[PDB]
Design a protein around this ligand. Sequence first.
Ligand SMILES: *C(=O)c1ccc(NC(C)=O)cc1
Ligand SMILES: *C(=O)c1ccc(NC(C)=O)cc1
Ligand SMILES: *C(=O)c1ccc(NC(C)=O)cc1
Ligand SMILES: *C(=O)c1ccc(NC(C)=O)cc1
Lengths: 32, 32, 31
Amino acid sequence: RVARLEKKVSALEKKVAXLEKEVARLKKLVGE
Amino acid sequence: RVARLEKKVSALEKKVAXLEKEVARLKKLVGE
Amino acid sequence: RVARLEKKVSALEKKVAXLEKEVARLKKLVG
Ligand SMILES: *C(=O)c1ccc(NC(C)=O)cc1
Ligand SMILES: *C(=O)c1ccc(NC(C)=O)cc1
Ligand SMILES: *C(=O)c1ccc(NC(C)=O)cc1
Ligand SMILES: *C(=O)c1ccc(NC(C)=O)cc1
């Protein structure tokens, strides 16, 4: 169970990094 | 401890799915 | 190993919170 969780967490980390970059680019495109 | 973590990771996987979908939609609307 | 996972999961939760806020703002401006 812990090994499987470790792999799920690593996958999530890669996706969240990404979303952060994508969100930062969209914020620039839309502007303020 | 591991069961509790599993629940948390499941909840995160759901939230990231979504964000991915929302971010794909916004990217299509902004273009580029 | 479990404590290392717990730290990683806490970190992700704070990051997803956020992304949700930022995305909610973007959705409102573009919608
Ligand atoms: C949990 O991810 C887990 C638990 C057991 C094993 N392997 C054994 C039982 O041979 C792998 C991973
Ligand atoms: C799409 O946003 C999407 C679709 C299915 C799920 N499933 C979870 C919430 O059980 C999440 C997000
Ligand atoms: C897991 O994150 C983990 C496992 C073992 C230890 N340390 C002790 C001494 O067993 C720390 C962290
Ligand atoms: C977002 O959910 C968030 C982050 C920081 C704060 N700080 C205030 C309330 O002290 C509120 C909400």
